[PDB]
Short mmCIF file of C-alpha atoms (C1' of nucleotides) and ligand atoms in Angstrom, two decimals:
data_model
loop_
_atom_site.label_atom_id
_atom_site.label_comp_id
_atom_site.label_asym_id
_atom_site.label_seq_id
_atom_site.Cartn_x
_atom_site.Cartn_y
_atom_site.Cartn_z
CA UNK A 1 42.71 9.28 37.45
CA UNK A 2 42.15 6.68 34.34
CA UNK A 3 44.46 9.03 32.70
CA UNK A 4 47.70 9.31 34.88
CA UNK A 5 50.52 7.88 33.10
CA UNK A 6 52.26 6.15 36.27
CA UNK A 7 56.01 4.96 34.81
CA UNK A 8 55.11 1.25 35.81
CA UNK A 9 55.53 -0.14 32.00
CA UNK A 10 58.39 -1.29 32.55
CA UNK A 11 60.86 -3.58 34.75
CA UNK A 12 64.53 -2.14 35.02
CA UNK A 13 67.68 -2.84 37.10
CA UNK A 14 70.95 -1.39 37.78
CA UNK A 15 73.56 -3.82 38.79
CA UNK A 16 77.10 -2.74 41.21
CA UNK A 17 79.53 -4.52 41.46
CA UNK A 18 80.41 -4.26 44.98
CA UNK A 19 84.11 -2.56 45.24
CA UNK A 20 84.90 -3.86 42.22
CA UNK A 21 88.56 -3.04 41.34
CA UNK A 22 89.13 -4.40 45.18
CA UNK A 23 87.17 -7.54 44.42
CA UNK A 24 89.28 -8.06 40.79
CA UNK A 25 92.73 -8.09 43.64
CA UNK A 26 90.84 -10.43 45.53
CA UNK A 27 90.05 -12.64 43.17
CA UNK A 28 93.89 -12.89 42.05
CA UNK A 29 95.27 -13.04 45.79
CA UNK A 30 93.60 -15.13 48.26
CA UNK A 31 95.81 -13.09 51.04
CA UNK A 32 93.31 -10.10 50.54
CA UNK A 33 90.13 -11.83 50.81
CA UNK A 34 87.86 -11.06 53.88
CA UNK A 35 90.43 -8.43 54.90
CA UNK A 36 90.46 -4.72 55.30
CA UNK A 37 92.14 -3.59 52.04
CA UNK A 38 92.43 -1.10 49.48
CA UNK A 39 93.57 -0.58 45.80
CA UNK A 40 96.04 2.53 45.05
CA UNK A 41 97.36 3.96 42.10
CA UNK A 42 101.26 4.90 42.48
CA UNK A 43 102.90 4.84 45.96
CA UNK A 44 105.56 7.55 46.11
CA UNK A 45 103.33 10.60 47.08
CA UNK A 46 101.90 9.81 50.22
CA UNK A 47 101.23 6.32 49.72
CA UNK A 48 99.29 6.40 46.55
CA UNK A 49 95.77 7.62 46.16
CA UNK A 50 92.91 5.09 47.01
CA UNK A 51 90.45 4.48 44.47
CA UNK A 52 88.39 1.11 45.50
CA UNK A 53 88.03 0.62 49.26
CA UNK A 54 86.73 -3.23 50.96
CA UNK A 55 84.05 -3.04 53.33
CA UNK A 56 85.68 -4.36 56.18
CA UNK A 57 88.25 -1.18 55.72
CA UNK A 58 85.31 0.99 55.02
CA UNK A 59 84.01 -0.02 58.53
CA UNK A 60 87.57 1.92 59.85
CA UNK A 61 86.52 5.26 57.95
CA UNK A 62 88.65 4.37 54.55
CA UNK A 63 87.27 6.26 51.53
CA UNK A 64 88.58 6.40 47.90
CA UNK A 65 89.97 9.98 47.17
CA UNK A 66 91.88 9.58 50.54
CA UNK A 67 95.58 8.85 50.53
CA UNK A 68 97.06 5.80 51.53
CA UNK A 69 99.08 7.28 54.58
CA UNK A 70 95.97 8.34 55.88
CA UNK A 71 93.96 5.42 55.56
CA UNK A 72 96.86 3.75 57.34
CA UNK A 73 96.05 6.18 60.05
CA UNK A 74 92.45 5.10 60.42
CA UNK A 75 93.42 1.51 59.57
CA UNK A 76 96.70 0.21 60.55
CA UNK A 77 96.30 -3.16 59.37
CA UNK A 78 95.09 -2.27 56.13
CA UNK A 79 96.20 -4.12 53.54
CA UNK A 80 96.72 -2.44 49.46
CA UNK A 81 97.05 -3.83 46.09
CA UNK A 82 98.32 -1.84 43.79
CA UNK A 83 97.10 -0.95 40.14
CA UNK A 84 99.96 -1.90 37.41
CA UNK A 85 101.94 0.97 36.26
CA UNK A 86 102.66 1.21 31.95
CA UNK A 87 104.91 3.50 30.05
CA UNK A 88 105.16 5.14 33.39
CA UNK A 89 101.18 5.65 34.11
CA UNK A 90 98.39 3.71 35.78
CA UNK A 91 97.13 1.21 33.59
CA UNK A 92 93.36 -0.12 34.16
CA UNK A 93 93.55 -2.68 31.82
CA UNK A 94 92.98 -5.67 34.29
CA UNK A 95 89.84 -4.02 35.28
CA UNK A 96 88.29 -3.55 31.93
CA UNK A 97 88.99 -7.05 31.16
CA UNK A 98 86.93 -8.37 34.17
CA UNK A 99 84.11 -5.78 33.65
CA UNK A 100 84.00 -7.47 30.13
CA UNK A 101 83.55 -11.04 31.71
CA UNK A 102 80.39 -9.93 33.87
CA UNK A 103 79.39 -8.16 31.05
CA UNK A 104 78.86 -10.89 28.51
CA UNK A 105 77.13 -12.92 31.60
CA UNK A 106 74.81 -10.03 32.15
CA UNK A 107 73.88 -10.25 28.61
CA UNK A 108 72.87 -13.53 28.30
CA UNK A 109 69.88 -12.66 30.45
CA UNK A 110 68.94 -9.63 28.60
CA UNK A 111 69.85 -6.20 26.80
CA UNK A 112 72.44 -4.64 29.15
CA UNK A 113 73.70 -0.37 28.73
CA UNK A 114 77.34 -0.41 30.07
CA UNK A 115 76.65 2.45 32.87
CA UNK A 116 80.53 2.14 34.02
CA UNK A 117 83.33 0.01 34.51
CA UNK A 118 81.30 -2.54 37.10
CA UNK A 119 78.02 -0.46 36.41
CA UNK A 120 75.00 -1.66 33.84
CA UNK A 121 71.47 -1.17 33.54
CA UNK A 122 69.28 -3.84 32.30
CA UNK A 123 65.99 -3.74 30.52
CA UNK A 124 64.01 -6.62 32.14
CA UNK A 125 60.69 -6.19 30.32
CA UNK A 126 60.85 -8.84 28.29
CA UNK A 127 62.59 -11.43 29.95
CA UNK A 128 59.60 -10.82 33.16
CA UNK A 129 56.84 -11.21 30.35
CA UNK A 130 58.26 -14.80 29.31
CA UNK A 131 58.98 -16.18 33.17
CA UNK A 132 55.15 -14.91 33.87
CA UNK A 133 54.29 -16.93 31.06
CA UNK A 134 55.93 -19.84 32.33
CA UNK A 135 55.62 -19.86 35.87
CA UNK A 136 51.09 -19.82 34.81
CA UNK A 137 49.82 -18.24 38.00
CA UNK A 138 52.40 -20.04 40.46
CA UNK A 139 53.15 -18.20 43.02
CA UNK A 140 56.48 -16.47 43.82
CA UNK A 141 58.47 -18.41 47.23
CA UNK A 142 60.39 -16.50 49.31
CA UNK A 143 63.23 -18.98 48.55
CA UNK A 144 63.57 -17.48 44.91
CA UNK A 145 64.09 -14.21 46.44
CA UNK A 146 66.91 -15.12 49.10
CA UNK A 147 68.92 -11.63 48.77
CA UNK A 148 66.24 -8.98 48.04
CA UNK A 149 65.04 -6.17 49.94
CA UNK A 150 61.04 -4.85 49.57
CA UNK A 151 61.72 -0.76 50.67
CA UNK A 152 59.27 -0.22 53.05
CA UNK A 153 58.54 -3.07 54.57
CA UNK A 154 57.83 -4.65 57.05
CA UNK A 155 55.59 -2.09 58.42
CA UNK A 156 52.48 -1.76 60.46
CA UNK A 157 51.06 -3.80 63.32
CA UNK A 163 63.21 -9.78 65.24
CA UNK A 164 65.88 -7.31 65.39
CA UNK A 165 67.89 -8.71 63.56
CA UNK A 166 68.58 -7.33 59.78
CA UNK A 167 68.54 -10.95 58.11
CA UNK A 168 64.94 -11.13 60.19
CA UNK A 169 63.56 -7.73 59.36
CA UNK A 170 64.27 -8.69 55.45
CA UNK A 171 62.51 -11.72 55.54
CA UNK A 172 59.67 -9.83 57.30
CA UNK A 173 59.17 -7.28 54.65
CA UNK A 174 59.59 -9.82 51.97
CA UNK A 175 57.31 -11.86 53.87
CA UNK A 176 54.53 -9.10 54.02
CA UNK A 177 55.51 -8.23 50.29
CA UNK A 178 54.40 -11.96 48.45
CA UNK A 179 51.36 -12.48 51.14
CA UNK A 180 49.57 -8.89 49.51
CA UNK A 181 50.75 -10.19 45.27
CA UNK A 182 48.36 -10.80 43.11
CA UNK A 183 49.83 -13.80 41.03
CA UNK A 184 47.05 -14.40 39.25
CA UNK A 185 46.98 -10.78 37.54
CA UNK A 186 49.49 -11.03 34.58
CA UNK A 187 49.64 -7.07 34.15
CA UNK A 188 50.30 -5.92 37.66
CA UNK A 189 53.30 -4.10 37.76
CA UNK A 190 54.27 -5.44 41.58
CA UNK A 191 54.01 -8.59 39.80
CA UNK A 192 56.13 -7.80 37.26
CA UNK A 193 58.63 -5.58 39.60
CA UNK A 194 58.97 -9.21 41.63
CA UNK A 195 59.33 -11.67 38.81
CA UNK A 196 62.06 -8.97 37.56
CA UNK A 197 63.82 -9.67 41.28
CA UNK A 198 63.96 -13.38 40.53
CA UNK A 199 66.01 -13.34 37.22
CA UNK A 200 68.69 -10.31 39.37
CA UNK A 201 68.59 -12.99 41.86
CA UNK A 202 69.49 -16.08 39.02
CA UNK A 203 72.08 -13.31 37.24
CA UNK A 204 73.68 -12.34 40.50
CA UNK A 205 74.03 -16.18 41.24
CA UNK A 206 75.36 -16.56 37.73
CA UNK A 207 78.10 -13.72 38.24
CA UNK A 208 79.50 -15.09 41.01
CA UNK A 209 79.50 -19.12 39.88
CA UNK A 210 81.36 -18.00 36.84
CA UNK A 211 83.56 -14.91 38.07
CA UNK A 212 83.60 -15.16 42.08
CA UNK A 213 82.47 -11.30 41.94
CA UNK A 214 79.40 -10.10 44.27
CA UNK A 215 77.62 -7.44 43.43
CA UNK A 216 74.42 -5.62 44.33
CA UNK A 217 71.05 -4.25 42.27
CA UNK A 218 68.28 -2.29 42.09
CA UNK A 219 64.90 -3.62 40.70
CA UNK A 220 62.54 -0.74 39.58
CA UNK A 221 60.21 0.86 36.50
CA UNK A 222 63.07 2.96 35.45
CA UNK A 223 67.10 3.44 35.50
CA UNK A 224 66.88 6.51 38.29
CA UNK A 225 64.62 4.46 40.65
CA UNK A 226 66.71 1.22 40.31
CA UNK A 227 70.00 2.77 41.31
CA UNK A 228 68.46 4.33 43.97
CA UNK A 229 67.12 0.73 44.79
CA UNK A 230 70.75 -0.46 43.91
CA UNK A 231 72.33 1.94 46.76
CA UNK A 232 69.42 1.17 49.93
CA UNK A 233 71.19 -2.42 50.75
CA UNK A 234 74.61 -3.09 50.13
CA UNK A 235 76.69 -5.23 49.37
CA UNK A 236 75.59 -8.55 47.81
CA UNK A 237 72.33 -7.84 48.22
CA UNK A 238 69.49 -6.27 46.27
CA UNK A 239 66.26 -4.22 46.46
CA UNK A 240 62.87 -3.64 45.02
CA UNK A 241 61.28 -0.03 44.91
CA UNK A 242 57.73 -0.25 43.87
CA UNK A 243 55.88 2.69 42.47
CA UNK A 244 53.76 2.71 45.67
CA UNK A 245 57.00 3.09 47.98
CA UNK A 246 57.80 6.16 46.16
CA UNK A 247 55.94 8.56 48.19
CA UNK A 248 57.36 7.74 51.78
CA UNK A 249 61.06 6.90 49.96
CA UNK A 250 61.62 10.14 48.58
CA UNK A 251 59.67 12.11 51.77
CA UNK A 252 62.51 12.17 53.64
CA UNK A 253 65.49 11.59 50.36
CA UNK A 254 67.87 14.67 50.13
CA UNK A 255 67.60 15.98 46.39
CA UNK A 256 71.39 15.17 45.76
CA UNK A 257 70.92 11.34 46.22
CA UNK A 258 68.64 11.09 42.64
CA UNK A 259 70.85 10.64 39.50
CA UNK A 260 72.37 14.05 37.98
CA UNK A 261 70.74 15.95 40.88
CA UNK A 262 74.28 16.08 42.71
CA UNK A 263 75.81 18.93 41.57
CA UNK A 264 74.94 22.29 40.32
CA UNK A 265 71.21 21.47 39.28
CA UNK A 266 70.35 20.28 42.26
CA UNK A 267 72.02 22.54 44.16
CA UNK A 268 69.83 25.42 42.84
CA UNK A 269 66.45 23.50 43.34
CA UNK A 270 67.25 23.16 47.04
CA UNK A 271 68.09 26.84 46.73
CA UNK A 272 65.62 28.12 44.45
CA UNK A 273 62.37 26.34 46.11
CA UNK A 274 64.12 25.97 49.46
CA UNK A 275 62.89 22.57 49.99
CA UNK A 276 65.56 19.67 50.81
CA UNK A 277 63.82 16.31 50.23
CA UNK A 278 62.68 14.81 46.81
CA UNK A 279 59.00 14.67 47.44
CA UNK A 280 58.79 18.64 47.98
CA UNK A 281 59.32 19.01 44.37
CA UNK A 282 55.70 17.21 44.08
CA UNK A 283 53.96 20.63 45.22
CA UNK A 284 55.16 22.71 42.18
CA UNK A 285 53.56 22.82 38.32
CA UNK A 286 54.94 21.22 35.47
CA UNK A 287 55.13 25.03 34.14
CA UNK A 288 56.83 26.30 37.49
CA UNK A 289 59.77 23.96 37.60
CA UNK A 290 59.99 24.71 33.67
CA UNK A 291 60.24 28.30 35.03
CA UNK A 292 62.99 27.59 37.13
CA UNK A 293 65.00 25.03 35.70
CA UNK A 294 64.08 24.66 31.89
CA UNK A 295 61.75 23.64 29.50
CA UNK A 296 63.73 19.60 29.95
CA UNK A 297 65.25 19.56 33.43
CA UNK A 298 61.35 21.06 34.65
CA UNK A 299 59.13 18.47 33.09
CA UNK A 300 62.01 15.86 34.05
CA UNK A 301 61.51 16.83 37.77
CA UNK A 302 57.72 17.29 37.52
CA UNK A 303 57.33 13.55 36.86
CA UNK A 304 60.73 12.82 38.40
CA UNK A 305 59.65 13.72 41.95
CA UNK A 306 56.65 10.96 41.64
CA UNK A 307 58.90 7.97 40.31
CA UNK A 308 58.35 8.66 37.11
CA UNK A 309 61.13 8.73 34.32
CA UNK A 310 61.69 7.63 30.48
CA UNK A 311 65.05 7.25 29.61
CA UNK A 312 65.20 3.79 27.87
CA UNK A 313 68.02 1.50 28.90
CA UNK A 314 70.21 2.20 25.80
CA UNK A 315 71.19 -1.24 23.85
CA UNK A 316 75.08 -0.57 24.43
CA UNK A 317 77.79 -2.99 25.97
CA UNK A 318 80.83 -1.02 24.83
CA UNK A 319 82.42 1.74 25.72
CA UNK A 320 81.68 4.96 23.20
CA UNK A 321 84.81 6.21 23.66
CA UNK A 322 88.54 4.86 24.58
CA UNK A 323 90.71 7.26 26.35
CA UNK A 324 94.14 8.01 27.94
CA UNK A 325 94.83 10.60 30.45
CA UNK A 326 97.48 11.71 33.05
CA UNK A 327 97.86 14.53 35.37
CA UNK A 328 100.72 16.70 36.02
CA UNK A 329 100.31 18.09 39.56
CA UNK A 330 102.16 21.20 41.10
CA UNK A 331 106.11 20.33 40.59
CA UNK A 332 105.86 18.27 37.67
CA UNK A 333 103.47 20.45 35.67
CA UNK A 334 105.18 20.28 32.02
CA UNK A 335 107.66 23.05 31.16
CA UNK A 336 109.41 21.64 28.18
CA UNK A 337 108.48 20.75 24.50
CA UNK A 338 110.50 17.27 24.93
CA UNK A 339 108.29 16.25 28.09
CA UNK A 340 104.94 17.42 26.68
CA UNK A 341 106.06 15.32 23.40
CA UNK A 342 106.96 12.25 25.00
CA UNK A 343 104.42 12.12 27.72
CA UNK A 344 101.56 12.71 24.01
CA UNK A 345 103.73 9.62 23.25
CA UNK A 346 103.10 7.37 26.35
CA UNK A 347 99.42 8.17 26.03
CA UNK A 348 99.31 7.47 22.31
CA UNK A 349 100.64 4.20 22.92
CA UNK A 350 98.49 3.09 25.73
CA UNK A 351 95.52 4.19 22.93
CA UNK A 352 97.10 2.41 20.43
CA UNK A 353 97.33 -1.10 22.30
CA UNK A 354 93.91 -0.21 23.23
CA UNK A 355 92.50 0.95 20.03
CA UNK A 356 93.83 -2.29 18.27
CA UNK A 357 92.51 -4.69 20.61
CA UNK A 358 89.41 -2.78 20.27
CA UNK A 359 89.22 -3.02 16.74
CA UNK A 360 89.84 -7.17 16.59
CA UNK A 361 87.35 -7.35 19.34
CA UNK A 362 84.60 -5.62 18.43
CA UNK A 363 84.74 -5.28 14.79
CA UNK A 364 84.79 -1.39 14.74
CA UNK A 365 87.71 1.57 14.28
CA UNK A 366 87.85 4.82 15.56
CA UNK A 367 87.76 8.16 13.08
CA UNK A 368 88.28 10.90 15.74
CA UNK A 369 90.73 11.71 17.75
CA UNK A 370 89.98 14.32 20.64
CA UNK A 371 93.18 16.20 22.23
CA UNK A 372 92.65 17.73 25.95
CA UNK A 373 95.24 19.87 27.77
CA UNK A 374 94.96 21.86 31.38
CA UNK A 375 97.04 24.87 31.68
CA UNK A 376 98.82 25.57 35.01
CA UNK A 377 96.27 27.86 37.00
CA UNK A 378 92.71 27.14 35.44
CA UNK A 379 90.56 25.76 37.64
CA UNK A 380 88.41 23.81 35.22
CA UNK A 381 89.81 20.57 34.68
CA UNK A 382 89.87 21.07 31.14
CA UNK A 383 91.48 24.04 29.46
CA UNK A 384 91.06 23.53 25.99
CA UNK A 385 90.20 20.56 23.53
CA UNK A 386 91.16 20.55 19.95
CA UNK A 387 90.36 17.07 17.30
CA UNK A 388 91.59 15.57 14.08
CA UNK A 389 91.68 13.02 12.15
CA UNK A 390 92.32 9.49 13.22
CA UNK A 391 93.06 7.68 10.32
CA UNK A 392 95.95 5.05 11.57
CA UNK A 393 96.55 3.05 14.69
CA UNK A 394 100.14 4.24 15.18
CA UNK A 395 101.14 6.21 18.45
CA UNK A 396 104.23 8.10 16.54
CA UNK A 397 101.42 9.71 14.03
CA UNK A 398 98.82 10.07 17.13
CA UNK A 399 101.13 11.80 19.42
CA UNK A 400 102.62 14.02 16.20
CA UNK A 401 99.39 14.87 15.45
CA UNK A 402 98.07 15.63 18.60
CA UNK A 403 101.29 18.19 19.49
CA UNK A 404 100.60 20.09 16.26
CA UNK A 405 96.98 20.69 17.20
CA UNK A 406 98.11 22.13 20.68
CA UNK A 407 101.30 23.29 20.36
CA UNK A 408 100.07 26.72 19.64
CA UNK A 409 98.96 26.93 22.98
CA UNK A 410 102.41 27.85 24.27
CA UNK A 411 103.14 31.03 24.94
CA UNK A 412 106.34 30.64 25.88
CA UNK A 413 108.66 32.86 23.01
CA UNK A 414 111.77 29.88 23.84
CA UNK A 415 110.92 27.18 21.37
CA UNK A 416 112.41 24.56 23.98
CA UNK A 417 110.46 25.72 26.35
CA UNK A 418 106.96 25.48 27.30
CA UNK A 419 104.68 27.52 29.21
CA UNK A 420 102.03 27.84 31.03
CA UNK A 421 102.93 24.68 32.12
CA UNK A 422 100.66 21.83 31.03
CA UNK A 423 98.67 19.53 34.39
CA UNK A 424 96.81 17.25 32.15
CA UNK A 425 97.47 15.46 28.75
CA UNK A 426 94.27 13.65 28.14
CA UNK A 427 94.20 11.54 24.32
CA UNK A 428 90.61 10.06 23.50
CA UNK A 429 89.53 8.12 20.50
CA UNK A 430 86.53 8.89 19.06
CA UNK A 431 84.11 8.22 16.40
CA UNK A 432 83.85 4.32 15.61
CA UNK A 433 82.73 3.09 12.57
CA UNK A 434 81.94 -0.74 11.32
CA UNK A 435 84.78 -2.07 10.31
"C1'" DA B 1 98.59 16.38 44.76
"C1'" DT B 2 93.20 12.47 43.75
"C1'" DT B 3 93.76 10.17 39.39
"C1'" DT B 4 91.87 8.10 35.46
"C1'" DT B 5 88.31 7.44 33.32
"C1'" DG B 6 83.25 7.76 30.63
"C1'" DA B 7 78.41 9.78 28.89
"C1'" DC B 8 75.60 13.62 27.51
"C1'" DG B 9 73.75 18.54 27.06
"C1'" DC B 10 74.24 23.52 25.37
"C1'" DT B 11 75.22 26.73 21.96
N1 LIG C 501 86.72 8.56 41.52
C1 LIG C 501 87.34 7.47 41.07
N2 LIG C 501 88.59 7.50 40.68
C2 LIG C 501 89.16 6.39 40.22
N3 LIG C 501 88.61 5.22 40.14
C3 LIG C 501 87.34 5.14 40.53
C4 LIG C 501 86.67 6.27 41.01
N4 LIG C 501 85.40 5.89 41.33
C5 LIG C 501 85.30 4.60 41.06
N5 LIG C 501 86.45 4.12 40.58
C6 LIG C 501 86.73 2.73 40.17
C7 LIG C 501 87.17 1.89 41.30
C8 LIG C 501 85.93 1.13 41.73
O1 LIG C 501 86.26 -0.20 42.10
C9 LIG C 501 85.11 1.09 40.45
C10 LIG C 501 83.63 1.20 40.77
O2 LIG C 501 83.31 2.40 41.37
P1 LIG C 501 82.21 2.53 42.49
O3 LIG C 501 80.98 1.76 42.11
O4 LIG C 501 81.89 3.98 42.73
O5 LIG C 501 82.73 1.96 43.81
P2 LIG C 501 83.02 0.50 44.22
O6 LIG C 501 82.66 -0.53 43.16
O7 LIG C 501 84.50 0.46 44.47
O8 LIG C 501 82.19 0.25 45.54
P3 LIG C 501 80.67 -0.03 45.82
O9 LIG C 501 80.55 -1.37 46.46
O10 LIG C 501 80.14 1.02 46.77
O11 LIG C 501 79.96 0.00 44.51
O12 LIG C 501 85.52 2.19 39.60
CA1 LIG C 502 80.40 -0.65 42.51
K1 LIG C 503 78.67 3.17 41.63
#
DNA sequence: ATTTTGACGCT
């Protein structure tokens, strides 16, 4: 009892942005906003592949993966933007640039870890202790809270959604205890009103929505993020835990959807987060490792440690194209001069990068996919990076795989290569 | 024939 650690020490969120490379088009042309549309990357195979999907065409069944014939299918009127196409690839750079502007907003509030393009976690600790400072035992109005979600509530003794969120947030600041500077609800709350002033501040200054979860740690607030979206946001106290995760499938919590989680559904045969709860520390360990068991032991009751990490930039900068069935590579010259689209992207990249940020890359990381393997990555060789020059990176990059060709024609190349993939590596102060 | 990214763990 007085000893349970409880994982309420601190206040975390996880901010969306709400269909972002969608929003970014809308931004630039009015004629897309409030409309059922999609962005696509190339159009001559089918339409182009979607990868960012509105929610009015996500009411019509529109995903991302699908192709943009189909989604036409489901969604005649849909309407597509279409991502610019350099040295004959797609080209993201727009995207990045935007993520950068709500970026540096999000940091003026507090430390930020760059999660994704439109994805960050923030550490709110802090910034809570000083607004509980200031606001000396005020309470908390509803009115600062216009866009949040309490999971859980209402409950107990409108049917409208706008109603049945004012309820629970209703029920929510009746039960605080303001006056109680260490309460975590407290704190969880006061963490809600500075998402709701950065969320305002976003869209002022960019005209991008986005939604957020407000928790005690990364896994719990973008699970929060996820419950109401878009352009809204959500609170998931410690005591919700127990009925949230009762009935949450195992492959909704972060890194348990794929093979790991897989095999605790299969292993324990139980389906919903809280099931893990009736296991040891040392049983899970059993099954799943001496990490990934005491990870789900104190997973499974909200509990989790990884610290937001204090990074805004990207690690890594990378460059990447597929070659899919027909136009797998079979020749030196278009393995060569593809390495040399790729290295020049990186290049333009890398040197922006480097008058940006103040930093170089030292590594640079070659990845190929042979015709017929399965994993998306055959093989992955490095070297040096010691200039930014695309005619050295692509040269270099060639002589590190071009002993993977088996082909006994020097002209010729085979197995045929379905990925070129150039990342940068490595940075250093500079 | 999703495509193009990015972060981290294992050995
Ligand atoms: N699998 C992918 N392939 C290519 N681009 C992707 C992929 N997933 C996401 N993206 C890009 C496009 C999205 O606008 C952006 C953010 O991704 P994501 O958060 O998953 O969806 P979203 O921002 O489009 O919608 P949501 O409102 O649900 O968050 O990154
Ligand atoms: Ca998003
Ligand atoms: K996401």
């Amino acid at each position: 009892g007085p000893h349970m650690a409880t994982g309420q020490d601190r206040v975390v969120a996880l901010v969306d942005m709400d269909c972002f490379f969608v929003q970014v088009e809308q931004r630039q042309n009015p004629h897309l906003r409030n409309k059922p549309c999609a962005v696509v990357q190339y159009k001559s195979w089918k339409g182009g592949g979607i990868i960012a999907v509105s929610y009015e065409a996500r009411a019509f069944g529109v995903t991302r993966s699908m192709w943009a014939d189909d989604a036409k299918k489901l969604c005649p009127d849909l309407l597509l933007a279409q991502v610019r196409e350099s040295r004959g690839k797609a080209n993201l750079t727009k995207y990045r640039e935007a993520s950068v502007e709500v970026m540096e907003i999000m940091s003026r509030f507090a430390v930020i870890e760059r999660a994704a393009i439109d994805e960050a976690y923030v550490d709110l600790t802090s910034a809570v202790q000083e607004r509980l400072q200031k606001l000396q035992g005020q309470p908390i109005s509803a009115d600062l809270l216009p866009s949040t979600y309490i999971e859980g509530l209402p409950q107990g003794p409108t049917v409208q959604k706008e109603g049945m969120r004012k309820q629970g947030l209703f029920q929510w600041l009746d039960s605080l205890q303001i006056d109680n500077l260490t309460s975590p609800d407290l704190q969880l709350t006061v963490g809600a009103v500075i998402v709701e002033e950065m969320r305002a501040a976003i869209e002022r200054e960019t005209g991008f929505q986005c939604s957020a979860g407000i928790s005690h740690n990364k896994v719990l607030a973008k699970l929060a993020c996820g419950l109401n979206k878009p352009n809204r946001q959500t609170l998931v106290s410690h005591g919700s835990v127990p009925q949230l995760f009762s009935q949450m499938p195992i492959r909704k919590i972060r890194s348990l959807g794929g093979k790991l989680g897989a095999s605790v559904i299969e292993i324990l045969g139980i389906e919903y987060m809280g099931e893990l709860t009736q296991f040891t520390e040392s049983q899970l360990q059993s099954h799943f490792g001496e990490k990934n068991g005491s990870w789900l032991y104190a997973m499974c009751r909200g509990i989790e440690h990884d610290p937001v990490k204090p990074r805004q930039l990207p690690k890594t900068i990378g460059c990447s194209k597929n070659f899919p069935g027909k136009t797998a590579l079979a020749t030196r010259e278009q393995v060569q001069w593809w390495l040399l689209q790729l290295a020049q992207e990186l290049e333009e990249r890398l040197t922006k990068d480097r008058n940006d940020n103040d930093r170089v890359a030292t590594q640079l990381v070659v990845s190929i996919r042979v015709q017929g393997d399965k994993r998306l990555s055959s093989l992955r060789r490095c070297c040096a990076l010691t200039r930014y020059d695309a005619h050295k990176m692509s040269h270099d990059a060639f002589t590190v795989i071009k002993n993977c060709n088996t082909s006994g024609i020097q002209t010729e190349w085979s197995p045929p290569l379905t990925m070129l993939f150039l990342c940068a590596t490595k940075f250093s102060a500079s």
